[PDB]
Design a protein around this ligand. Structure first.
Ligand SMILES: O=C(O)[C@@H](CO)O[C@H]1O[C@H](CO)[C@@H](O)[C@H](O)[C@@H]1O
Ligand SMILES: O=C(O)[C@@H](CO)O[C@H]1O[C@H](CO)[C@@H](O)[C@H](O)[C@@H]1O
Ligand SMILES: [Mg+2]
Lengths: 251, 252
C-alpha cells in the first residue's frame, strides 16, 4: 500500500498537520506505510514543511525522489533526483505573454508579484510566500473572477493547460497529479508495495489523483465525486477518519 | 501668468516624450512664463524627464520647490524643499488592505508588482518602471474593468480617495491637483506673476486642476468638462495650439 495525499486541505488545510492528522500520520508511519504528498506547492514549500522525498510538487509538474532511490530515474540534484514531467516555469511564463496578447488583457501570476503581495493574497507569511514563488513548472494565476473565462480560452489557444487548486487557477503544460502518481508507482522499487494505491484529496477537483489510485477518498465538504469515498468531517479529523476506517483494517 | 500642465496625455506624447512639446515650451520660456508640471508621476520620473522644480507630483501629493525658493516652506532634501500634502504611500497601502477585505477580492497596485510587471503593464522600460514604482504618496491601481465599481466603493468605504490619470485608477488621501496648485500659487514669490493661472490637462485627475486656475484648457479625447476650453487635437499638439491661440494673444 502507498498513500498519496493532497496537502491542500487533506493534511494541511489549517496551515500544518493538526492533532488528529498527526496521530493518523504517525500510525501510518509505524505500520511502514509510505505516504507521498501530492501538492500544488513547490519543492521549497514542501521542504520547509519538513517533508522527505518522494513527493510530487506543482500539480504533478515535478516528481522528487531521494538521490539514492533504488530505481534510477530523473536528474540528480543534491540530495534529490528530479523527474520533470511538465514544461519549465520560464517557458510557461513566455506562453502566458502570448496569451495576454490573445486575450487583449493582462494575465497576472505569482511571477509578477512581490512576496508580500503573494503573502497577502494567500494568507502565507512573507517567508512562505517566497517559497511559493520559487516555482519550477507551474504558475499560480491571480485572475479577476469576471475575466477567468476569456483568460482560460487564451491559455489553451497558446498550448497551455489550466487547473483549479482550491483558491487559484494554475497554468502549466504537462503537470497532472494522476500522471505523476502513475509515474511514481511505475518507479516504485517494490512493485508489490505499489500495487494498491490510496488517494486522499480535499478538492472536488482532485479527480486526476482519484482516477490514478485504487481507493479514492474525498475529505472535504459536500458530496464526493462518483466512485469516490467520503468522510463525515473534513480536515485532519476527516483524514484520521479515513485512515482509521479505510486503511488500518487493511494492515 | 503661470502655466500649470499635466504631463501624460497633455505635455507628453503617446510614448512619454517631451520632443513634440519642446517648441511650445520654448515660446513660454522666451516670454519668461513659468511652466509647472502637475502630474500623476513620481519625483524620480519628473527628474528623469529633466524637469526642474517647482513641480507637483503624484496627483498633488507632494509639492517640490527649489532649495532656495524665496518663500520658506516644506522640508529640505538636498537641492529641494518638499511640501507634503497627502498621506504617505505606506499609509495608503495599509488602508488598501482594508478595502481589499471589504471588496472580497484582490486590489493590486504597483506596490504589489515587480518593476518587470509594471513595465509590461505600462509600456515603460524596466528602468522607467522602477521610477514609477518609487511612490511617496499615491498608489497606481491595476484593476480589471469589471471590478472597478466595487473597488471604488470599497476605497470610499475605507476613507481613501480615488481618481484616474488617463490610463489607470489611483488611490490616495489628500492628493488633489487643485489643492497643490493653490498651495503653490500662495507660495509664489511674485503675487502679480501668480495672479493669472492657466491649466492644461486631459484626464479625470485634472478636473481639480481646471477648477484651481483662471484659464482652463482640455487637450484630452472627446468633449471637454463643462465650460472648459477645447483644442482641435489632443495631447502635445493640443498644448501647442493652446499656447499659440489662447496664451500668446493674452501675453500681448
Ligand atoms: O491553488 C491553491 O489554492 C493552492 C492550493 O492548491 O496552491 C497555491 O496557493 C498556495 C497558497 O495557498 C501555495 O502554497 C501554492 O504554492 C500555490 O501557489
Ligand atoms: O494614471 C495614468 O494614466 C498615468 C498618468 O500620468 O500615471 C500612471 O501611469 C504612468 C505610466 O503610464 C506612470 O508614469 C505614473 O507614475 C502613474 O503610475
Ligand atoms: Mg493624464
Amino acid at each position: 500500500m502507498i498513500v498519496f495525499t493532497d496537502l491542500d486541505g487533506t493534511l494541511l488545510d489549517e496551515r500544518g498537520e493538526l492533532g488528529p492528522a498527526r496521530e493518523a500520520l504517525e500510525r501510518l508511519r509505524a505500520l511502514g506505510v509510505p505516504v507521498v504528498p501530492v501538492t500544488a506547492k513547490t519543492r521549497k514549500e514542501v521542504e520547509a514543511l519538513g517533508l522527505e522525498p518522494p513527493f510530487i510538487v506543482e500539480n504533478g509538474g515535478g516528481l522528487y525522489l531521494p538521490r539514492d532511490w533504488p530505481v534510477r530515474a530523473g536528474r540528480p540534484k543534491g540530495g534529490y533526483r528530479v523527474v520533470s514531467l511538465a514544461w519549465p516555469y520560464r517557458k510557461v511564463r513566455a506562453r502566458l505573454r502570448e496569451a495576454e496578447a490573445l486575450a487583449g488583457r493582462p494575465i497576472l501570476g505569482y511571477g509578477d508579484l512581490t512576496a508580500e503581495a503573494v503573502a497577502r493574497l494567500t494568507g502565507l507569511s512573507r517567508e512562505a510566500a517566497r517559497r511559493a514563488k520559487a516555482r519550477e513548472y507551474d504558475e499560480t494565476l491571480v485572475l479577476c473572477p469576471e475575466e477567468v473565462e476569456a483568460v482560460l480560452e487564451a491559455l489553451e489557444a497558446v498550448g497551455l493547460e489550466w487547473t483549479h487548486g482550491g483558491r487559484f487557477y494554475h497554468a502549466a503544460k504537462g503537470a497532472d497529479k494522476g500522471r505523476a502518481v502513475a509515474r511514481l508507482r511505475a518507479l516504485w522499487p517494490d512493485p508489490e508495495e505499489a500495487r494498491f494505491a490510496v488517494g486522499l484529496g480535499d478538492s472536488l477537483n482532485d479527480l486526476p489523483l482519484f482516477r490514478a489510485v485504487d481507493l479514492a477518498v474525498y475529505v472535504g465538504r459536500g458530496d464526493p465525486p462518483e466512485g469516490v469515498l467520503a468522510t463525515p468531517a473534513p480536515g485532519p479529523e476527516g483524514f484520521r477518519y479515513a485512515v482509521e476506517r479505510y486503511l488500518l483494517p487493511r494492515l
